[PDB]
Scaffold this active site. Structure first.
Site, PDB file in Angstrom:
ATOM      1  N   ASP A  32       0.826  -1.233   0.000  1.00  0.00           N
ATOM      2  CA  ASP A  32       0.000   0.000   0.000  1.00  0.00           C
ATOM      3  C   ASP A  32       0.849   1.267   0.000  1.00  0.00           C
ATOM      4  OD1 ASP A  32      -3.264  -0.318   1.332  1.00  0.00           O
ATOM      5  OD2 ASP A  32      -2.306   1.668   0.958  1.00  0.00           O
ATOM      6  N   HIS A  64      -3.585   5.902   3.950  1.00  0.00           N
ATOM      7  CA  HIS A  64      -4.231   4.645   3.567  1.00  0.00           C
ATOM      8  C   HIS A  64      -3.601   3.406   4.104  1.00  0.00           C
ATOM      9  CE1 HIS A  64      -6.049   1.842   0.683  1.00  0.00           C
ATOM     10  NE2 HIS A  64      -7.054   2.726   0.800  1.00  0.00           N
TER      11      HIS A  64
END
Ligand SMILES: [Ca+2]
Ligand SMILES: [Ca+2]
EC number: 3.4.21.62
Length: 275
Positions: A32, A64
């Protein structure tokens, strides 16, 4: 004061915690935007960055990756939240920049790093509408190598009879995760299609944010980590199981919801899945 996010309870992770299984010794890669190493409610075991302009994978400029990581394994202590697999070994594999985008090669480089480093589970809370030959070859290589590969299904809702599942969730070797609300009904943004595998909570998911913060997000990228964490609980109880066995058990022990087009096999139940 620590809270247990309802999504954790919803998949029955606490029953495994009570048997004494919390994900110990299982290596999970969060592919990510990075994981904020300054957060006291996270323990990072390692990592690597594939983003040439943002070389520290311990610096999350998008927020995130940190939120995803917290759902997987926020520590069981006196503060913040509690992850699905609080004792899992967390790896920050940064493939996404400050804006949330990333090139396909960075993503593939990150999957290659995870295989090389013998990750048990990979979480990919990302997706695009287009796949590539090399991206498929890389996920396939992960599964062939014995890794459990989990990915968000996508936030493209429905489109009649077409599949709206993005890549890489659309590939058969990956488990694609759609989102349900707290009443087990699919979130209206949750992608659908034949390639949809299982559901997990993805509405108002409270987790860790950078800067020693906490906050809720909605999306199938928040559903995904629940399943990655579940896979880590399974492996902590049955270390000898193959990814084949873990994927099978997760899909064969779900709570059936509606039509598979919309729900896959249903909501995961890690207490059942773990045997
Ligand atoms: Ca905590
Ligand atoms: Ca799939």
């Amino acid at each position: 004061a620590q809270s247990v996010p309802y999504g954790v309870s919803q998949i029955k992770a606490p029953a495994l915690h009570s048997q004494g299984y919390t994900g110990s010794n299982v290596k999970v890669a969060v592919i990510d935007s990075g994981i904020d190493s300054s957060h006291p409610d996270l323990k990072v075991a390692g990592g690597a960055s594939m983003v040439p302009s943002e070389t520290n994978p311990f610096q999350d400029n998008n927020s995130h990756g940190t939120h995803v990581a917290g759902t997987v394994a926020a520590l069981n202590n006196s503060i913040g939240v509690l992850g699905v697999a609080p004792s899992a070994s967390l790896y920050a594999v940064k493939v996404l920049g400050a804006d949330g985008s990333g090139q396909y090669s960075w993503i593939i480089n990150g999957i290659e790093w995870a295989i090389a480093n013998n990750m048990d589970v990979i979480n990919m809370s990302l997706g695009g509408p287009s796949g590539s030959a090399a991206l498929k070859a890389a996920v396939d290589k992960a599964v062939a190598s014995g890794v459990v590969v989990v990915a968000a299904a996508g936030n493209e809702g429905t489109s009649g009879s077409s599949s709206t599942v993005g890549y890489p969730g659309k590939y058969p070797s990956v488990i694609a995760v759609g989102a349900v609300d707290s009443s087990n009904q699919r979130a209206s943004f949750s992608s659908v299609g034949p390639e949809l595998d299982v559901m997990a909570p993805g509405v108002s998911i409270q987790s860790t944010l950078p800067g020693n913060k906490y906050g809720a997000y909605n999306g199938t990228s928040m559903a995904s980590p629940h399943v990655a964490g579940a896979a880590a609980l399974i492996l902590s109880k049955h270390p000898n199981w193959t990814n084949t066995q873990v994927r099978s058990s997760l899909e064969n022990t779900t709570t059936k919801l509606g039509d598979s087009f919309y729900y896959g096999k249903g909501l995961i139940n890690v207490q059942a899945a773990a045997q």
